[PDB]
Design a protein around this ligand. Structure first.
Ligand SMILES: *[C@@H]1O[C@H](CO)[C@@H](O)[C@H](O)[C@H]1NC(C)=O
Ligand SMILES: *[C@@H]1O[C@H](CO)[C@@H](O)[C@H](O)[C@H]1NC(C)=O
Lengths: 49, 351
């Protein structure tokens, strides 16, 4: 099963500066975000192999 | 027995009498609920609607000012986004009754706006920032725009906040109405009027209309006194309605003109600083439907007697202790009165 190396940490927005959320796991082929119950659009995700 | 006056034999004991008393309490509460439900729902609806409408107006004004900054002053973003969000958040908070000072809102807004103007529009090229914040107020760089904005938004936000508070207090008093507990003697009189006829073995006998009138006038003694204050509350609200949206929408025009006014003296400002450092339709319809309830506390005993089984003919009816052929004839209330007095004084002094 996939083991998370870099689990997302609760971010805080300061002075309207958008802070992105990090996610790193191995072994992983597809990683998606489920923000507030629903899936996040494919365009918002930025994958690194 | 202690409630049903025993003329002779009786079919009920003390326990059945306590049962009749509890059922009388429940029936009276249900009747008051049925009388107050429509007005309660109306005021709850309007409170929710106006709160949502005001939040929509605040959001619209917020990103209108955001769009005007983004289109006309792209060099001031994203700091402009931050202090505009802060200002409109504080505006929404003051609208929702929080302890917020309008003059302090405008002053913090302009103290945040001036340094980015100086660093990105007048002198393109951080730790001396507080000195610039001071120069905002010590040199009066924005002229008379800040006092104008202060008065314009303070008037509208204060009247809107008082309007929402008045709506909530109306909700509170109408919801207290159907929960009013009455005296023991009033309860015993209700038990005698509604159920003690069954203790005597009568099946379909209804109480006399005049007996219901005297019983209800004895019970609703303090409640009818609320009628004058409720009428004055309705009239003061109608006076107050006859706006927050226009001010919050013209805010961006005023801020843009203030920025131009500041830029018109950059020549000397940079040198001296370097040296020194359907809503109206909804209110109208609400007022028109609310005026139809100005006699709510005066027609309430009439409602209770007309919506209960009564012998309006006063012939072969129950007078409370026998079957006759012809009838012969505060603390919580004080709190409601005090709250009404307060809200009425506020509505009077506003408009
Ligand atoms: C995230 O935002 C930064 C700037 O805020 C930008 O450079 C980057 O391309 C953005 N990525 C996505 C996926 O939006
Ligand atoms: C209104 O907010 C949206 C949110 O994404 C933004 O795209 C838009 O540019 C804003 N309006 C302006 C500044 O014209």
């Amino acid at each position: 099963l996939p083991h998370f190396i870099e689990e997302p940490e609760d971010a805080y927005i300061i002075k309207s500066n958008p802070i992105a959320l990090r996610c790193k796991a191995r072994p992983a082929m597809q990683i998606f975000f489920k923000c507030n119950g629903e899936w996040v659009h494919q365009n918002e995700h930025v994958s690194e192999e | 027995l202690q409630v049903c006056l025993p003329k002779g034999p009786t079919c009920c004991s003390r326990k059945m009498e306590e049962k009749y008393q509890l059922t009388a309490r429940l029936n009276m509460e249900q009747l008051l609920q049925s009388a107050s439900m429509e007005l309660k729902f109306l005021i709850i609806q309007n409170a929710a609607v106006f709160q949502e409408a005001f939040e929509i107006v605040v959001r619209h004004a917020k990103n209108y000012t955001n769009a005007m900054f983004k289109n006309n002053y792209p060099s001031l973003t994203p700091q402009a986004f931050e202090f505009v969000g802060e200002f409109f958040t504080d505006v929404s908070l003051y609208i929702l009754g929080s302890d917020i000072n309008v003059d302090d809102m405008v002053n913090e807004l302009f103290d945040s706006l001036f340094p980015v103007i100086y660093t990105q529009l007048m002198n393109p090229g951080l730790d001396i920032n507080e000195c610039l914040r001071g120069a905002r107020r010590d040199l009066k760089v924005f002229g008379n725009f800040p006092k104008l904005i202060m008065t314009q938004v303070s008037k509208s936000l204060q009247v809107t906040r008082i309007f929402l508070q008045a709506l909530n207090l109306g909700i509170e008093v109408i919801n207290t109405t159907d929960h009013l507990k009455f005296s023991k003697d009033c309860g015993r009189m209700l038990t005698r009027m509604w159920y003690c006829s069954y203790c005597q073995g009568l099946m379909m006998v209804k109480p006399c209309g005049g007996y219901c009138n005297v019983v209800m006038q004895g019970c609703m003694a303090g409640v009818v006194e609320i009628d004058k204050y409720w009428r004055e509350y309705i009239l003061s609200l109608e006076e107050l309605v006859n706006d927050m949206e226009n001010v919050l929408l013209g805010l961006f025009s005023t801020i843009h003109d203030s920025i131009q006014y500041v830029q018109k003296n950059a020549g000397k400002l940079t040198t001296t600083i370097g040296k020194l450092c359907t809503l109206s339709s909804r209110r109208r319809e609400l007022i028109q439907k609310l005026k139809s309830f100005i006699s709510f506390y005066s027609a309430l005993p009439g409602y209770i007697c007309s919506h209960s089984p009564v012998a309006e003919n006063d012939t072969l009816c129950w007078n409370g202790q026998e079957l006759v052929e012809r009838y012969s004839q505060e603390p919580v209330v004080s709190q409601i009165i005090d709250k009404l007095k307060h809200i009425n004084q506020l509505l009077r002094t506003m408009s």
